[PDB]
Write a protein that binds this ligand. Structure first.
Ligand code: 99C
Length: 187
């Protein structure tokens, strides 16, 4: 389809590799560092300064300060997940609302069937069909972050015209304990 045929002409495929040292201890990152799950119990890990210790987030290793980039995530049948990008300098220690004002640009799924944009305040999405695979797209210069259904090419959401002052990481958040992982598809 056009989404498959054109995306690489417009956006550089990011090889997103999950960074274990950022992951809240309640998350488990696969050996191959492409998948993240929620665990029954905290891993025995240090509170090193890269680690999210309140939100259940994990980042990719590589950040971006420029250009056009995209990666894809298998959300599959998980009932709960949020993904997006965040500033290098977000508050990783202690509570903060994941908003654009606080350097998170994310959308996701709660409670099986309630898709929403993590704006302040939050905001419902009506999706025709439920995505099994989301494409996340960043254009640093224009300031656009967009999500697409990466199978059928449908638009999910765009944050328009954000002024970035910072390096941006891919970010992923899962709250619930569930058979299906969040998994990054390489190119
Ligand atoms: C089981 C469970 C574990 C942890 C939490 C608090 C978190 C996010 C929720 O942040 P909040 O602002 O309350 O909701 P939202 O970011 O989804 O809107 C963890 O990242 C909640 C539920």
């Amino acid at each position: 389809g056009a989404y498959n045929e054109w995306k690489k002409a417009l956006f550089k495929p990011a090889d997103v590799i999950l960074d274990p040292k950022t992951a809240n201890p309640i998350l488990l990152v696969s050996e191959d560092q492409r998948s993240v799950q929620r665990a029954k119990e905290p891993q025995d890990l240090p509170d090193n300064p890269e680690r999210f210790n309140w939100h259940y987030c994990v980042l990719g290793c590589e950040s971006f300060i420029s250009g056009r980039h995209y990666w894809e995530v298998e959300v599959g049948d998980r009932k709960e997940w949020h993904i997006g990008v965040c500033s290098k300098n977000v508050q990783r220690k202690g509570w903060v609302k994941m908003t654009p004002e606080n350097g998170f640009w994310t959308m996701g799924l709660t409670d099986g069937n309630k898709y929403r944009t993590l704006t302040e305040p939050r905001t419902n999405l009506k999706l025709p069909k439920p995505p099994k695979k989301v494409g996340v797209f960043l254009d640093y210069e224009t300031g656009d972050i967009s999500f697409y259904n990466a199978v059928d090419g449908s638009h999910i959401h765009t944050f328009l015209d954000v002024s970035f002052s910072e390096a941006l990481y891919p970010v992923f958040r899962i709250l619930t304990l569930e058979p299906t992982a969040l998994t990054i598809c390489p190119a």
